[PDB]
Each structure stands twice: as C-alpha cells, then as structure tokens.
Tab-separated table of C-alpha atoms and ligand atoms in Angstrom:
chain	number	residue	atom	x	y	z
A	1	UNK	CA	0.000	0.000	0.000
A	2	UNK	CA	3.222	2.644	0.317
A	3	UNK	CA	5.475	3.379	-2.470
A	4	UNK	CA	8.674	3.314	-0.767
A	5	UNK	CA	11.209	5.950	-1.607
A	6	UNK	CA	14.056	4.027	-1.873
A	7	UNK	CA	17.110	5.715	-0.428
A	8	UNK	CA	19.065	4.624	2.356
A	9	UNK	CA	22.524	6.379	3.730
A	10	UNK	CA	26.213	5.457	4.643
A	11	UNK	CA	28.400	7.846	6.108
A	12	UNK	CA	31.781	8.240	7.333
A	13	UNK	CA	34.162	11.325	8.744
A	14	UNK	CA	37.603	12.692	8.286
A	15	UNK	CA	40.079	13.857	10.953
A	16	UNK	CA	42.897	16.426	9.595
A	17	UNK	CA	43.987	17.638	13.453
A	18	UNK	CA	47.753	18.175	13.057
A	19	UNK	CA	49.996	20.598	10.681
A	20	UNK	CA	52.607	18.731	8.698
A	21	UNK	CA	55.491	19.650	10.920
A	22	UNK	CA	56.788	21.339	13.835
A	23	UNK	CA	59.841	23.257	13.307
A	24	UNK	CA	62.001	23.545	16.812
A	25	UNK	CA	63.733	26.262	17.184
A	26	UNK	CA	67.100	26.457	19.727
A	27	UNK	CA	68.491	30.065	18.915
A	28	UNK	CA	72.432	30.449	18.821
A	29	UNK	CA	74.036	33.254	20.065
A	30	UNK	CA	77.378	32.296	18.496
A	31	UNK	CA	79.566	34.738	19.946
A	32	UNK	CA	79.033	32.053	22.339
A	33	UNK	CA	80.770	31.416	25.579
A	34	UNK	CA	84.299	30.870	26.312
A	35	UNK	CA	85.123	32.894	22.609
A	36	UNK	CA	85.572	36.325	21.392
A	37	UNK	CA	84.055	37.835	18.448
A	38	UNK	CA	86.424	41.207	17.348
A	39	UNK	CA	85.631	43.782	15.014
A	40	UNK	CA	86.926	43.495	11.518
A	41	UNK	CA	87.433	40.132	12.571
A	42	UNK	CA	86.924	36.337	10.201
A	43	UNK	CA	85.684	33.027	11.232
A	44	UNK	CA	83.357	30.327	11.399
A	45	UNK	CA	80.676	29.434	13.673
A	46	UNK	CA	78.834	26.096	14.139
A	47	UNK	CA	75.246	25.312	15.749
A	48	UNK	CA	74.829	21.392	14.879
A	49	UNK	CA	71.353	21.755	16.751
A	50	UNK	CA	69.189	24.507	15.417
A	51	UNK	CA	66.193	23.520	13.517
A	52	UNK	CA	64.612	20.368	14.820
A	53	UNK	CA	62.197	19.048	11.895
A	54	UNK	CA	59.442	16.856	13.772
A	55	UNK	CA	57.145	15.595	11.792
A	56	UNK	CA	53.951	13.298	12.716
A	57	UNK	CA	53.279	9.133	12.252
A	58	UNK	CA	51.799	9.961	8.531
A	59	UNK	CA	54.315	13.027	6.435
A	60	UNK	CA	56.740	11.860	4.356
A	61	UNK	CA	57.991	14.061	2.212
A	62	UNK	CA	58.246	18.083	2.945
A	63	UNK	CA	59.668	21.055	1.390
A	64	UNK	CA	60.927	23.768	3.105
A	65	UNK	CA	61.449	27.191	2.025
A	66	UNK	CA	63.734	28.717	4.447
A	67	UNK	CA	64.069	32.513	3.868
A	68	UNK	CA	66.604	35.480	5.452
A	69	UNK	CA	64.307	38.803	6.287
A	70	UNK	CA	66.453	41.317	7.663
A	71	UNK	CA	69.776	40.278	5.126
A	72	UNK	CA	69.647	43.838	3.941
A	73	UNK	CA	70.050	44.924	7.593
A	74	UNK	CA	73.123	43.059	8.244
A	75	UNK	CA	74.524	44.287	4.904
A	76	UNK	CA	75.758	46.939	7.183
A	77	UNK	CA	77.095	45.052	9.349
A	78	UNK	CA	78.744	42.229	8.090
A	79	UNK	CA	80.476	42.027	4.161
A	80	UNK	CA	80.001	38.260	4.083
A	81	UNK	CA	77.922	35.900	5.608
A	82	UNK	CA	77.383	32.485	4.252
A	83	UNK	CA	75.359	30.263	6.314
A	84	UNK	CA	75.099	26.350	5.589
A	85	UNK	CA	72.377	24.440	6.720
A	86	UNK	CA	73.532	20.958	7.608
A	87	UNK	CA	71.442	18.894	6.733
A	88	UNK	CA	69.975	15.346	8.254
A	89	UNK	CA	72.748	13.489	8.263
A	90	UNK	CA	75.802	15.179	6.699
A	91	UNK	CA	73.865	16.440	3.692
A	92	UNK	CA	73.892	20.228	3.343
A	93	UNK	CA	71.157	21.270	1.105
A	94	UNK	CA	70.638	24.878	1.677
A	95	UNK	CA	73.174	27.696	1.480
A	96	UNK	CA	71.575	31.459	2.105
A	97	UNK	CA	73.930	34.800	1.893
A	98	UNK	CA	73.435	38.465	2.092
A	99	UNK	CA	72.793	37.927	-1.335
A	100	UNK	CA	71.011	35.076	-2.966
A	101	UNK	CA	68.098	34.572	0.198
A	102	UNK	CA	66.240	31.744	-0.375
A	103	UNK	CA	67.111	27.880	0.696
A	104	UNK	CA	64.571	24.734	-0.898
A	105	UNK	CA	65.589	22.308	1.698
A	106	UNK	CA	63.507	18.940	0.868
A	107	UNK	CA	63.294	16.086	3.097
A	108	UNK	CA	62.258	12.583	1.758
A	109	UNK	CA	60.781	9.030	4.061
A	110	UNK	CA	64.843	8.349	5.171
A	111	UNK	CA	65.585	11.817	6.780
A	112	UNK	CA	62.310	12.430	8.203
A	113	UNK	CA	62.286	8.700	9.558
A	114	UNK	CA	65.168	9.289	11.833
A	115	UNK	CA	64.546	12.510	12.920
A	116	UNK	CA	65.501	15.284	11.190
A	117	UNK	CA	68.150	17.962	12.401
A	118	UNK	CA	69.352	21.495	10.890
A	119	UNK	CA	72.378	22.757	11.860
A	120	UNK	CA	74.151	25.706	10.675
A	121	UNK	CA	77.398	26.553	9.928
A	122	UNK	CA	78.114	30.177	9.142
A	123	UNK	CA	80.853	32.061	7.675
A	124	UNK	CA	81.442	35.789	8.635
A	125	UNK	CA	83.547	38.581	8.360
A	126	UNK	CA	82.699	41.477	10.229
A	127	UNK	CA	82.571	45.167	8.358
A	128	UNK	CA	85.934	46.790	9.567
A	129	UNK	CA	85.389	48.840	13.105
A	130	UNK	CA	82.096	47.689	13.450
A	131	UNK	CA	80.793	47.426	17.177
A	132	UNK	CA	77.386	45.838	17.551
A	133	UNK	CA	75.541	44.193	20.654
A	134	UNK	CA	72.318	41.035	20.322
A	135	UNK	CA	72.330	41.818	16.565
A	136	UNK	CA	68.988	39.196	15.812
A	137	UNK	CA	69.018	37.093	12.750
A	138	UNK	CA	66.056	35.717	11.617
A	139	UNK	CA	64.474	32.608	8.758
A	140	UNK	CA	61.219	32.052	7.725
A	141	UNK	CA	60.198	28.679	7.234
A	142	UNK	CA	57.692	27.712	4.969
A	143	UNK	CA	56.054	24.607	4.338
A	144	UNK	CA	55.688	25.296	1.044
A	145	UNK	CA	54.778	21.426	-0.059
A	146	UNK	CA	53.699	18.305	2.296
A	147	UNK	CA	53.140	14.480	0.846
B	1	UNK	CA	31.069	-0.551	5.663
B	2	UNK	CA	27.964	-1.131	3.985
B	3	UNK	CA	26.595	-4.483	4.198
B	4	UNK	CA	24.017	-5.454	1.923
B	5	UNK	CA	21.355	-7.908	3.537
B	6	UNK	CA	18.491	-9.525	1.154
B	7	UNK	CA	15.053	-11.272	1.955
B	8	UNK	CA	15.518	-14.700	0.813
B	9	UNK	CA	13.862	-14.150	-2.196
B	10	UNK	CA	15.784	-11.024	-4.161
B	11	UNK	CA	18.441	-12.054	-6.235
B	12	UNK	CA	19.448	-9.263	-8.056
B	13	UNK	CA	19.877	-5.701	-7.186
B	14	UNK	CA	21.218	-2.568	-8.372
B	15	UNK	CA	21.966	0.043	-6.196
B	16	UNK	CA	23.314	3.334	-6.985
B	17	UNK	CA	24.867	5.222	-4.626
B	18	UNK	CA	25.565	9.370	-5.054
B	19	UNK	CA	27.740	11.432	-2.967
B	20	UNK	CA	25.767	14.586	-2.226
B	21	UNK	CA	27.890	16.569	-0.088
B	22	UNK	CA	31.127	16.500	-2.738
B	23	UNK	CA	30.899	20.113	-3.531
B	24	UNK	CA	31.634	21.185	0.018
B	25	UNK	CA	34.425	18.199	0.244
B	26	UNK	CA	35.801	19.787	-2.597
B	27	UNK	CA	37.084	23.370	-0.836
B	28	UNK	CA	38.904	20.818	1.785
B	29	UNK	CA	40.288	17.807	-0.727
B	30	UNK	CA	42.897	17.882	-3.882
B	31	UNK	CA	41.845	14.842	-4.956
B	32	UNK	CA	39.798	11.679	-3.294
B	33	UNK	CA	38.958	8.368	-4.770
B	34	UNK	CA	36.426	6.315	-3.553
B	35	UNK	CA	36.775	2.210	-4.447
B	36	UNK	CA	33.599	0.676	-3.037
B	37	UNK	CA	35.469	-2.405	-2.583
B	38	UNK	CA	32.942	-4.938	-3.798
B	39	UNK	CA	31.187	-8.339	-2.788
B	40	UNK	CA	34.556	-11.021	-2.792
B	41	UNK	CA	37.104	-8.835	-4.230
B	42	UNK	CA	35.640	-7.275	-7.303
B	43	UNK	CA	35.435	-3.753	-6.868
B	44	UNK	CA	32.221	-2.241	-8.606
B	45	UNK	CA	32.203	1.231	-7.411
B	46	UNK	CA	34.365	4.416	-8.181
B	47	UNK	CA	33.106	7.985	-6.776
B	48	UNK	CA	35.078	11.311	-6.741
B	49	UNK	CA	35.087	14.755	-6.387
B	50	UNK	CA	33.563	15.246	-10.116
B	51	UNK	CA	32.622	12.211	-11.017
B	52	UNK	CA	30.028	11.431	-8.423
B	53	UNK	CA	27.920	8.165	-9.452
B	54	UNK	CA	28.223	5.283	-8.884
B	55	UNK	CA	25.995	1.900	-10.386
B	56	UNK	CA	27.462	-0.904	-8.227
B	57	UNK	CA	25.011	-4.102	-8.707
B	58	UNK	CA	24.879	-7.153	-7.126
B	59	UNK	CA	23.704	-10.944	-8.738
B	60	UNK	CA	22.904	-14.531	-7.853
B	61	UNK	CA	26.084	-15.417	-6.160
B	62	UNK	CA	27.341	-12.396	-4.650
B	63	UNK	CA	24.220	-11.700	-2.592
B	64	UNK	CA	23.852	-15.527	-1.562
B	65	UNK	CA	27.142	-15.131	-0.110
B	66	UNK	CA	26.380	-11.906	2.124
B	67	UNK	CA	27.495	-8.937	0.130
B	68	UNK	CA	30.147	-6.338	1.871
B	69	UNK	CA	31.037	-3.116	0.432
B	70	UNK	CA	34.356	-1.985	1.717
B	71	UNK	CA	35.753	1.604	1.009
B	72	UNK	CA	38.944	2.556	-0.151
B	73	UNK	CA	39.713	6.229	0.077
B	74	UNK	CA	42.621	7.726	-1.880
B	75	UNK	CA	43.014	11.442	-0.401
B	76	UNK	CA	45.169	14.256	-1.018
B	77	UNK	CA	44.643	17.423	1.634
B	78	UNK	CA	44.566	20.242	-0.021
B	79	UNK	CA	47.670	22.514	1.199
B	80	UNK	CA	46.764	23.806	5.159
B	81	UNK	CA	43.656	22.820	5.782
B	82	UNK	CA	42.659	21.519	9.463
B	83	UNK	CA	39.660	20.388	10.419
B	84	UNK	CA	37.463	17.979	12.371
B	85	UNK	CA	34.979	15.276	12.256
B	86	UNK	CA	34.318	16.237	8.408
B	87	UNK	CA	31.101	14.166	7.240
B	88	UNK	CA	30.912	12.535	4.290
B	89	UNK	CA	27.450	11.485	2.982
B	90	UNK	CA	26.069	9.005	0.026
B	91	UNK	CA	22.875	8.037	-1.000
B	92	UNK	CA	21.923	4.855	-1.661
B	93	UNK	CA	19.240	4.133	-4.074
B	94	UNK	CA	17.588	1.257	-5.313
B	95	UNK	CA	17.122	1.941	-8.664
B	96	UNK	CA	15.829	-2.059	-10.004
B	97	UNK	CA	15.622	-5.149	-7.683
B	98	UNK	CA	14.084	-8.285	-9.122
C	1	UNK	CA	14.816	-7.792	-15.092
C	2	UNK	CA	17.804	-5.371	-13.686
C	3	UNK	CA	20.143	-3.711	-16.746
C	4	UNK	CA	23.493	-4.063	-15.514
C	5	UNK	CA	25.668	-1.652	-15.836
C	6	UNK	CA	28.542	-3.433	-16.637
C	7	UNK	CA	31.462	-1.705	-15.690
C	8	UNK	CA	34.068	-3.429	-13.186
C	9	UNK	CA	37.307	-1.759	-11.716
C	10	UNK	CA	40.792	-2.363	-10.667
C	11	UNK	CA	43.379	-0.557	-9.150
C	12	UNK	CA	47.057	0.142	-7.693
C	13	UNK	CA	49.277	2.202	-6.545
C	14	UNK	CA	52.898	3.534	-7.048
C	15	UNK	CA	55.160	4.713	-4.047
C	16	UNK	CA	57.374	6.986	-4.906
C	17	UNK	CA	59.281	7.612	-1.849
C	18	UNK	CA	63.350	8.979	-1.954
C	19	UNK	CA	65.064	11.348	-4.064
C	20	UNK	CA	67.670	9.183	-5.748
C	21	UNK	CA	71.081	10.274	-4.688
C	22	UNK	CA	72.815	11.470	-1.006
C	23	UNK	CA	76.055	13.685	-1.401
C	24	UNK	CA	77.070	13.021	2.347
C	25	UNK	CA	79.606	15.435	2.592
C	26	UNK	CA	82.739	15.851	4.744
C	27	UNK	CA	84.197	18.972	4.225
C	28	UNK	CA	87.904	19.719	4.035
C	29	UNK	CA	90.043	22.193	6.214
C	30	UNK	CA	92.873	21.931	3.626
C	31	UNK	CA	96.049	23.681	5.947
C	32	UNK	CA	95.577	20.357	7.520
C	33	UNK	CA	97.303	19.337	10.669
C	34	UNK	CA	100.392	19.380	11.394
C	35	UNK	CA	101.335	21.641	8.042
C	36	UNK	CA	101.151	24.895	7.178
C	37	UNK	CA	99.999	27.473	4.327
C	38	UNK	CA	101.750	31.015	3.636
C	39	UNK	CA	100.763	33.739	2.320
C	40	UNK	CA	102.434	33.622	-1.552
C	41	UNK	CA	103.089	29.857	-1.282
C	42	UNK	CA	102.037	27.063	-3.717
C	43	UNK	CA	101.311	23.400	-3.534
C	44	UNK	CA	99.007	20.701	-4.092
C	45	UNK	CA	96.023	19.576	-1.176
C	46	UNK	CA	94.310	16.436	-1.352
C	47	UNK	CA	91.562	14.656	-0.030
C	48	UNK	CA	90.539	11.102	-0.610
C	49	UNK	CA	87.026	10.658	0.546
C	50	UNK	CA	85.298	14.258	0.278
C	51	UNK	CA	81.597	13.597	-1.313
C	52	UNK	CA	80.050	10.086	-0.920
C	53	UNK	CA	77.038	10.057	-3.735
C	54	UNK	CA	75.263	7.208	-2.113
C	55	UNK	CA	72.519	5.614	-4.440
C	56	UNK	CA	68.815	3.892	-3.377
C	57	UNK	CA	69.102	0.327	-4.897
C	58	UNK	CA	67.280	0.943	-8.064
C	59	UNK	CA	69.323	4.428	-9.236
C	60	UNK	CA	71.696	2.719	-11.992
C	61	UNK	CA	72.475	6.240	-13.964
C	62	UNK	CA	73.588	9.690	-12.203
C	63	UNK	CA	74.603	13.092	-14.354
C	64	UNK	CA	75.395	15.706	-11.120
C	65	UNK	CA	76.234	19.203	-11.864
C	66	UNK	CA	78.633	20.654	-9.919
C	67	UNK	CA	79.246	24.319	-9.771
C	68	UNK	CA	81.529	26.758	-7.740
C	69	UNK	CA	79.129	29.384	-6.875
C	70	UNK	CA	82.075	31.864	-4.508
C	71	UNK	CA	84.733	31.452	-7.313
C	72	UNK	CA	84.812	35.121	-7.721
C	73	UNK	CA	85.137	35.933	-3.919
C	74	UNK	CA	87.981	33.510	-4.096
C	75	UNK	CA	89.667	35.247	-7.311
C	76	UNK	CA	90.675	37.980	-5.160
C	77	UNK	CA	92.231	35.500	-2.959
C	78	UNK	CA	94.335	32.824	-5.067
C	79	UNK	CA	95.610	33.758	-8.040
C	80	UNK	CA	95.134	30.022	-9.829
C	81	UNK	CA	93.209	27.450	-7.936
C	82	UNK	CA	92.557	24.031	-9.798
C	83	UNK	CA	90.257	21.701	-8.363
C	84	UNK	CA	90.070	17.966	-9.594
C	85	UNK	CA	87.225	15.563	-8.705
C	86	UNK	CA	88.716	12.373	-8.448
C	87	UNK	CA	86.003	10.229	-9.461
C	88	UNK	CA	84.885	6.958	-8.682
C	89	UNK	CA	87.418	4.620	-9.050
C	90	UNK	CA	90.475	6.516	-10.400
C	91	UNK	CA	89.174	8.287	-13.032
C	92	UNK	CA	88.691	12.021	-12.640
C	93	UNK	CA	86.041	13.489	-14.218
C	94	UNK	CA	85.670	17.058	-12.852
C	95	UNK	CA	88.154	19.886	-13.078
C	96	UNK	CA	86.897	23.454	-11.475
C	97	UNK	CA	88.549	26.781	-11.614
C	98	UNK	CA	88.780	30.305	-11.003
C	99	UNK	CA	87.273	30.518	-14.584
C	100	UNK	CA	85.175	27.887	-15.850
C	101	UNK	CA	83.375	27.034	-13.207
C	102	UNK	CA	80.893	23.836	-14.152
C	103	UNK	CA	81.356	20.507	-13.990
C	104	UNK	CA	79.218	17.025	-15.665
C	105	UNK	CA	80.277	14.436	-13.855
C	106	UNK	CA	78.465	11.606	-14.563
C	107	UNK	CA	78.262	8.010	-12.790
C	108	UNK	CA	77.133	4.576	-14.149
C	109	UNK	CA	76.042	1.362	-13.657
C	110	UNK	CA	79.265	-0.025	-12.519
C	111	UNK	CA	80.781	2.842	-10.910
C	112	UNK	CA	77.353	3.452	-7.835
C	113	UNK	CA	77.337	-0.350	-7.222
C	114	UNK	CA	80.600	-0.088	-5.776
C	115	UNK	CA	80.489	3.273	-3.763
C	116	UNK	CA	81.243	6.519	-5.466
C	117	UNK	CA	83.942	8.171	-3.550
C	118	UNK	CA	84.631	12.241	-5.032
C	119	UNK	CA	88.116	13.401	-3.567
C	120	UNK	CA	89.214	16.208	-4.181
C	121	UNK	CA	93.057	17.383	-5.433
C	122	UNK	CA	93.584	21.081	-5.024
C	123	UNK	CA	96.229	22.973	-6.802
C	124	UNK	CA	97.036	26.371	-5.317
C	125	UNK	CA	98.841	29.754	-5.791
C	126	UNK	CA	98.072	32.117	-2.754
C	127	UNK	CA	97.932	35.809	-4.071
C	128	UNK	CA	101.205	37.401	-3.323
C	129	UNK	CA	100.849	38.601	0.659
C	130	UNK	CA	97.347	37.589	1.710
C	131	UNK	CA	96.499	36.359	4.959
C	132	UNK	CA	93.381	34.869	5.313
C	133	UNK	CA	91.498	32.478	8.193
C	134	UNK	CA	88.634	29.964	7.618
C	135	UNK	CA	87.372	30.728	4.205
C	136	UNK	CA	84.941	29.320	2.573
C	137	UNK	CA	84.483	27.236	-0.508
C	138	UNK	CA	80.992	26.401	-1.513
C	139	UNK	CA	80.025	24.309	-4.307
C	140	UNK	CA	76.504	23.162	-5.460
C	141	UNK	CA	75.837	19.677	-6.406
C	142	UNK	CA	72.805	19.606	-8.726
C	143	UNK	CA	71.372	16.404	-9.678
C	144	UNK	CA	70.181	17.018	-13.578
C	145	UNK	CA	69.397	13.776	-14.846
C	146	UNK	CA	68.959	10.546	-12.950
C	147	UNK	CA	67.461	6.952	-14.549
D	1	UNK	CA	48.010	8.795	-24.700
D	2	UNK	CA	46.447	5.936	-25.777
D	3	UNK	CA	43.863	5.497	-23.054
D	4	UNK	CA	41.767	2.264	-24.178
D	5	UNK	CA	42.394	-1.324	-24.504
D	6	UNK	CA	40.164	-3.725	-25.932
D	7	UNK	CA	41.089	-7.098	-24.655
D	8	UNK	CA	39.155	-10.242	-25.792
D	9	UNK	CA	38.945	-13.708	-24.695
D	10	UNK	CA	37.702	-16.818	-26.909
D	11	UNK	CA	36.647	-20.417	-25.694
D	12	UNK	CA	40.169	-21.725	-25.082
D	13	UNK	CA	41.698	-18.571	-23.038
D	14	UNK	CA	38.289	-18.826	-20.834
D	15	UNK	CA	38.634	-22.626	-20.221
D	16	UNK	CA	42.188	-22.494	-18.532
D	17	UNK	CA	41.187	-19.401	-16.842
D	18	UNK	CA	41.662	-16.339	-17.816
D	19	UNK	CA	44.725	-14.168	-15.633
D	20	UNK	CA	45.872	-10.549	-16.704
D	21	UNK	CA	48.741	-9.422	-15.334
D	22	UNK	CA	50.422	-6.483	-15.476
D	23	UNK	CA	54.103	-5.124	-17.230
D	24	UNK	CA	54.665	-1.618	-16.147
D	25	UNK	CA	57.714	0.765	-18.093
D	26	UNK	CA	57.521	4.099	-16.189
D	27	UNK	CA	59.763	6.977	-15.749
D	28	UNK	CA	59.233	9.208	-12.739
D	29	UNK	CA	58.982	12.557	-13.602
D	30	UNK	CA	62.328	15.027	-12.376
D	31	UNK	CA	61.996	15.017	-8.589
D	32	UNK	CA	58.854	14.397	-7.974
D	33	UNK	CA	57.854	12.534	-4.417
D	34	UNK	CA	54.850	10.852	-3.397
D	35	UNK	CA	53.125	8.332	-1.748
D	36	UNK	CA	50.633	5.876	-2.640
D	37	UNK	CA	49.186	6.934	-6.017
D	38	UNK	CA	46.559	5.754	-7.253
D	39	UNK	CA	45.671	4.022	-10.585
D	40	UNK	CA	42.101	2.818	-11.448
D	41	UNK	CA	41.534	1.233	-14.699
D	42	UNK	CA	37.216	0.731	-15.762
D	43	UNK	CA	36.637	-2.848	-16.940
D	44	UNK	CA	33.638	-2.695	-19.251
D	45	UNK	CA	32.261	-6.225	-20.563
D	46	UNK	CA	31.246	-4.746	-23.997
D	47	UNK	CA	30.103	-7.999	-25.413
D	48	UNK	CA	29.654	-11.464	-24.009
D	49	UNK	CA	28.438	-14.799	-26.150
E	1	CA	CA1	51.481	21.750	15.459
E	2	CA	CA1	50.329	17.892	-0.656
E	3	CA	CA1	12.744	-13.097	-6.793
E	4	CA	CA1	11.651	-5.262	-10.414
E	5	CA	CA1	67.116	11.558	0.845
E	6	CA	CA1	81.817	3.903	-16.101
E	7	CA	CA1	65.011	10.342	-15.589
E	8	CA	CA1	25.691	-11.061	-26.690
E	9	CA	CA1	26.943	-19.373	-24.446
C-alpha cells in the first residue's frame, strides 16, 4: 500500500587535526661562551642543533622554504655571511647569503624517519670597526609542499 | 562498511549510490577516490570529487554469499587545511531489484 | 529484469618515496694538521674521501652538476686554484677553476654499485701577501638527470 | 596517450582461466615525491556470447 522511496545512507568522517610539521627552534648566540668575536674580525661558527624538523606518524615528504628577512640589515654590518644548513645526516642542502636569500631544503621518508636535524654553519667577516651588541638574525620557514 | 542484507527471495539488485555533499568536500580535498570495494574482491564502485555516481550491482552469487562493500579512500589534503569530524554522505538508491 | 551496468574496476598504486642520490659530505680544512699554508706559497692539497654520492638500490644512472658558486670571492684570494674531482674509481672526471666554473660528472652502472667516492686534489697559488682564516668554498651539487 | 584497450577472450583462453597481469615501463617525472598513487583502470564487458 506505500510506495517506498528508496534511499538509504552510509556515512563516514575525516580527521585532519595536526599541521605537517613542527619546526624547533634552539636560537644560537654564536659569539658564544668561552670565545671572542672582534671587530673586523673572520671566522666560522657552528650550531649542529638549530632547527629540529618533527614531523607526525603519517608526512613523508616536505619542502621547506627557508628565507633570510632582515639580510639587507646586516649588509651593514657584516660584508660576508654564508650560512650552511647541515642537513639530516651530513647532507647540506641549503646555502643562504646576504645575497642570494632563499634555501629549498627537501626532506624525503629516510631523513624524516630518523629525525631530522638542521644545523648551521656560518661564515662571517665582520665590516671593519664595526661594534654591535644582540644583533637578531632571523628565517622564515615555509612549508611550502607536504606528501 | 555497507553491508548489503536480502530477503531470501531477491536475487538481483542494483543500487546506486551518489555522494551529495562533494561540492563542500571539494574546498577541503585535492583529490579523493572512492573504491567501493565490492562483494569477494571485485570492486564495482568508483566515486570522486567530479565524477560522483556510482551503479554498483549485485547478482545470484554475490548476494547468496552476504554482500560487503568496503571503502577505499585515496586522499590528497589540499595545502593547510585543518579540520574535524568532516562528514561525508552518500545516497543509496535502489534503482531495479528483481 | 535489472540492466546491468557493466562496468568493473581495478586498481594500484605507485610509491614513490626517496630522491635518488645522497652527497654526504665531509668537508675539508685543507692547511691540515700538522702543516702549514703562507701567504704567496704554492702546492698541491688532497683529499681522498670528500663527497660520498650514495645511491637507493634501483638508481643505476647519475649526471650531477657541480658548480663553484664563490669562485669570484675567491679570485681575489688565489691567483690560480685548480680543483680535480677524483672520481669513482680513479678516473677524474671534474676539473673546477677560477674561470670555468661547471662541472658534468656523470656516474654509471658499474661505478654506484661499488660506492662513489669524489676526492678532491687542489692545486694552489696564494695571491702574493694575503692572509686569510677559515674561508669558505661552496660548491653546489645539482642532480640534472637521474634513470 | 592511448587510453583504451580492448582485450578479448575466446573459448580456449576462458577454459584455462583467464589471468591478466600487469608489465609496467615508467619513468618518474624530475623530482617528484609521493606516496601511494593511485591508478584505477574501468573494466567494461562490452560484449559477451
Ligand atoms: Ca602543530
Ligand atoms: Ca600535498
Ligand atoms: Ca525473486
Ligand atoms: Ca523489479
Ligand atoms: Ca634523501
Ligand atoms: Ca663507467
Ligand atoms: Ca630520468
Ligand atoms: Ca551477446
Ligand atoms: Ca553461451
């Protein structure tokens, strides 16, 4: 006696909760303890801890774009700066200067999968007589592409 | 996920199921492929974001045999997007039973 | 009494996981230990194990770029600096200078399943009177072609 | 390119049992990284006897 209308349902839900990645910061302050930093002066200084990539159970492949602000700042203060970003383990794969500023560090299933560390390694030479004090130095990191 | 039960008289059935709520799905996914895994390992059923229908139907000896429908979801997030508890909705018609 | 719609499906999937080649590098400090660079002086500085290219166990054919990207810092430092890539085995397919600064070394089949070891020999001319500490030498390793 | 395939079977293939594997010659594109593609082929049964 009813004409059935003949539709029945299945349904399901997604979670997305996390972001891709969680970049750590540690800061360095490399005139660092127990040194001397001079005006005029040339060296190298060397962080092996200073971007801690942590990623969750499911990425496995990112691309960072790693980018230097305030380089046209310390163009007055410094006449060349070369900092290496060491890589997971040994690789370097990004290399930013006063100059050319942007870094395309990409991390693939090995380097994420044993936790993946950024140090840096920096080459300076200080602009001659220059006397500075908690000059700040600072990267933007952009998750430009997550798999 | 879906489990198809008959009367002990229908043998064959075809069912076609819709996704209605794609277009909203479609500002949070890239891409997402939908493989209504079928009765014993045939799959009958492919739904996604455009192409959204789906004719999956059923005979003699798949429904005497207690017919499952299993998904498999293929998904790409689109770039940033978090969310939660995002529902996902198909209809399920029967079109012809006999 | 139904019309089938007769359309069945199947399906896979391909995991496409590393990128194919790791330069783990180990840098050089090339006065060495236990010798000694002045200013004017000439020589020769070696290396034997300087970039590792280590392969995933499908890559079979490599084609890396390798460029000096601070040459022309450098050129007001050394007045000829010749820089040979000993290759995998004993050949030595790279040679970098002051002025032609790119180099196609290429690896095969038989040269990754072994290990490809890149030393580096260093022929040098310090610019008459220049005194120098910790510079840098930077050069970009750019995988064009893999198979 | 060539998207379609048009694969039939006569009374001798059918009575061993018909199997259809696959021979795959790819190429991965420069650089690219990802994880669990998918690939769905449709299997229409144009005409039976
Ligand atoms: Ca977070
Ligand atoms: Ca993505
Ligand atoms: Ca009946
Ligand atoms: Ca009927
Ligand atoms: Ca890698
Ligand atoms: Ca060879
Ligand atoms: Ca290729
Ligand atoms: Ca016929
Ligand atoms: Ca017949």
């Amino acid at each position: 006696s009813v004409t059935s209308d003949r539709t029945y349902y299945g349904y399901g839900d997604v979670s997305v909760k996390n972001e891709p990645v969680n970049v750590v910061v540690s800061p360095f302050s490399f005139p660092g303890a127990n040194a001397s930093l001079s005006s005029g002066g040339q060296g190298v200084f060397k962080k092996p801890d200073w971007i801690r990539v942590v990623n969750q159970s499911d990425v496995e492949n990112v691309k960072l774009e790693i980018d230097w602000v305030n380089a046209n700042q310390a163009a007055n203060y410094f006449d060349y700066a070369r900092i290496l970003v060491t890589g997971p383990n040994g690789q370097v794969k990004g290399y930013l200067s006063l100059q050319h500023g942007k870094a395309w560090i990409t991390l693939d299933a090995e380097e994420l999968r044993e936790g993946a560390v950024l140090g840096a390694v920096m080459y300076y030479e200080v602009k001659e007589g220059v006397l500075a004090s908690r000059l700040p130095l600072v990267f933007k990191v952009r998750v430009v592409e997550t798999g």
